[PDB]
């Protein structure tokens, strides 16, 4: 009945409890909250980091993770399956639900159409047909990353209350168009936590889907923080406490990534470097990984003592354990 | 020494004991029958369902399953390995046998020749060279499915004795020629259990290999049931207690599936629907999965309360645990 | 801090202790030396045998192995990652190091250049950036195989002291050029153990890289054994106690394997057979596997009671457990 599809679906108190359980697990990693239980990790797209953290997380709590990497499933109802689909998600979710206690789902968008991708069909289908809790391991939003990220910020600042912090979610250069998942999640969680958020991107075409812009706005009101869109690098970084980098192809160009290649390439200066970081208030830098060094961020920034990307990546483990424990 | 290659190899009392242990495991899933033991699940062909049930089954009994998906093995003796084969099954089975306590084998036929496929070389080779019990996870017969299927029928009818039940194994439409494995197993187990069996198919060309027809006949005599081949849909369904659907390419066409495409396509009416099911004696419907909705069976039949396909799929878990426990 | 990259890095006393712990584990396989611990098995190249032994080894000691098969990683520093690499080994090793207690690495050479391959970049990179012990699961040397091999010899001869034994590392025919890893390791460990070693190959072009020739020489001096290069089959086998076969492409031909195909094909007589084995002092035969029957060794030699290849393969399990236990 209760799933962990997006943090936006959980009340603030529930998210706070998850973060605290995550901190507790970080102090005592071995437990029995999942003793004799199991989780099916269904990866429609490969991920070494996510597979490792979840698999180990289940093991450490006495459970077992079954890793499934399909590779042809039909999600549409009343559809004559005479095509290339062998079985309907109805049967898949229901069968797995007779075996495991939880189901994790990872499904990256096709990038051939944001119009379709934004529907989150794969995840919504599992959540609808599954008799057991479903966990978003990343589709168009990365909720587990949000919490790992948030925990890392709380540990860094020495407090659970992040209000008053200047948070800068900056777009970054990449030779190819990327998913907005991490970006959408970053906006969601930074505002939900009540920080002064600024979405820094090259042009208005890079502004995130309305769904998330509304989420952020709605969260600003609840948390007492602030939101703001910007296109000026130097002013955005100024006096910033946190800088989060993430690359993503402008939504208005989904389907054809040819005329955009020259557009993104003229913005290879949005790379986070010491010059920019020095403008902040001794702010910290982080990225969700994988990160292309000297493209999204310079080797100097990465190896800096202000980069907490490795801590954030570690926290995926502790945060995902808190989620699995809450759902069982 | 003792393997679980086919149910036909086990006495009726042993099969009854397996089914009962399976029911016991269904009531108490956690156990120690495999404590510290392991099973190697060798999949020459991918299977999410079979991998999940076996892996979880080993975990629940205190054991560990190692999943191996090759992808070049030689099974022929005295064959100069100067071809594309790197190692002989002799070495593979013997080495794995020094590591694990049980070996599961899944190997779908090549469909390029039923003449060769019917030899069950992969399975027979493992059973011959392996120092530990071998388990058929599906090749040309699906013995684990047979028991999962049989258990589901016993639970549905509220009794272990299925004698007197009208069982209809019906062929079903599919855009492509399929393996007869599930069909051969269905005939084997339905007759072994003593039911009034009817093999419903379009033309005599779809009759199953003699090996299984003889098995069925031999089982009818032992169980006190009956066997019968039919080509009339309405008469077959009439007063039926159980309807099992399965698609499969006529054996006489193995090698060339071109002139058969038009032959099978003219029989897309063999699809199980409410019209047919209504003719039975409030009979139950089931399929081994994966099932193409609105092709092999209509969405109406699938979502009906008489469809026990999800229960049968669940039982793969309990039945496979009974098998692993009996073999160690 | 301490890794298991090559046996040559460990003192003789440490190697002796590993071999003894391995013998102890062979007598009592279940233990708690890895209770609650985990190892990441990173396979850049597939290996059923190595995956099975390590995974089971972790399970038997109360731990858990996470299997990762990438398939695009950058190992070069200060390299603008605008190519086909998504993330730097720096981030990979560091993140995995926050999750698991040990990291195993398997990476076969590209064969496109021994000049580059001999650098052991993949392994050295992991060992440099990883915060936890790294284990060579085979790159250009196969140290786990060395110990499995050595243990099998000690069990066969009924003593830990192998000094005085005539060891013949023979090159063998193969339709394609192979890695020297196993060959380099065989020379290393046979000399380190103090045996009378003879490297039997067709022509001086097949002599192993200087690195290992020096290693052997340096080991002969320490162990009191002997080294010797030979090109005469009959004289090499004569009075031999141990015969180890392994195929490998001459190092001087790395990059272009066309003019070598005809060169290796004229030496298909280097195959180990009863005629040759009969010349030894009732010597034992072994191979690391996979082995092409009737090409590297005849079916007669393989099925002989003097072939200890299956025992050596089994010992990978016990030896790898000793290594994992020593590193944690």
Features:
homotrimer, 328 residues, alpha/beta, Rossmann fold, 2 domains, five-stranded parallel β-sheet, amino-acid biosynthesis (chains A, B, C), amino acid binding (chains A, B, C), transferase (chains A, B, C)
Name the CATH superfamily assignment of the largest domain in chain A.
Answer: Aspartate/ornithine carbamoyltransferase
Q: Give me the side-by-side strand order of the main sheet of chain A.
A: 9-8-7-10-11
| SSE pattern of chain A, N- to C-terminal | HEHEEEHEHHEHEHEHEHEHHEHH
Main sheet properties of chain A:
5 strands, parallel
The CATH topology of the largest domain in chain A comes to: Rossmann fold
Main interface: chain pair and counts: A-B, 27 and 26 residues
Number of domains of chain A: 2
Distance between the termini of chain A: 11 Å
Structural class of chain A: alpha/beta
As an assembly, this protein is homotrimer
What is the 3D form of chain A? globular
PDB class: transferase
Keywords: transcarbamylase, Cytoplasm
Assembly: trimeric
Entry title: Crystal structure of N-acetyl-L-ornithine transcarbamylase
């Amino acid at each position: 009945l209760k799933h962990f599809l997006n943090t936006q679906d959980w009340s603030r108190a529930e998210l706070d409890a998850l973060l605290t359980q995550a901190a507790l697990f970080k102090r005592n990693k071995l437990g029995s909250e999942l003793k004799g239980k199991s989780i099916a990790l269904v990866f429609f797209n490969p991920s070494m980091r996510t597979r490792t953290s979840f698999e180990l997380g289940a093991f450490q709590l006495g459970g077992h993770a079954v890793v499934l990497q399909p590779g042809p499933i039909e999600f549409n109802l009343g559809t004559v399956m005479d095509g290339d689909t062998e079985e309907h998600i109805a049967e898949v979710a229901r069968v797995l639900g007779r075996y495991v206690d939880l189901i994790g789902v990872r499904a990256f968008p096709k990038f051939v159409d944001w119009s379709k991708d934004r529907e989150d069909q794969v995840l919504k289908s599992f959540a609808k047909y599954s008799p057991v809790p479903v966990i978003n391991m990343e589709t168009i939003t990365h909720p587990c990353q949000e919490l790992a990220h948030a925990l890392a910020l709380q540990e860094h600042f020495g407090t659970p209350d992040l209000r008053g912090k200047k948070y800068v979610l900056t777009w970054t250069y990449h030779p190819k168009p990327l998913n907005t998942a991490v970006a959408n999640s970053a906006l969601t969680i930074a505002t939900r936590m009540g920080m002064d958020v600024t979405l820094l991107c090259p042009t208005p075409d890079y502004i995130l889907d309305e769904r998330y812009m509304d989420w952020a706005a709605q969260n600003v009101a609840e948390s007492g923080g602030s939101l703001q869109v910007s296109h000026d690098i130097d002013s955005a970084y100024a006096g910033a406490d946190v800088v989060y980098a993430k690359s993503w192809g402008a939504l208005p160009f989904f389907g054809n990534w040819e005329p955009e290649k020259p557009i993104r390439d003229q913005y290879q200066h949005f790379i986070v470097d010491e010059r920019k970081m020095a403008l902040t208030n001794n702010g910290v830098f982080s990225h969700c990984l994988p990160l292309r060094r000297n493209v999204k961020a310079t080797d100097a920034v990465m190896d800096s003592p202000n980069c907490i990307a490795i801590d954030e990546a570690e926290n995926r483990l502790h945060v995902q354990k808190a989620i699995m424990a809450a759902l069982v």
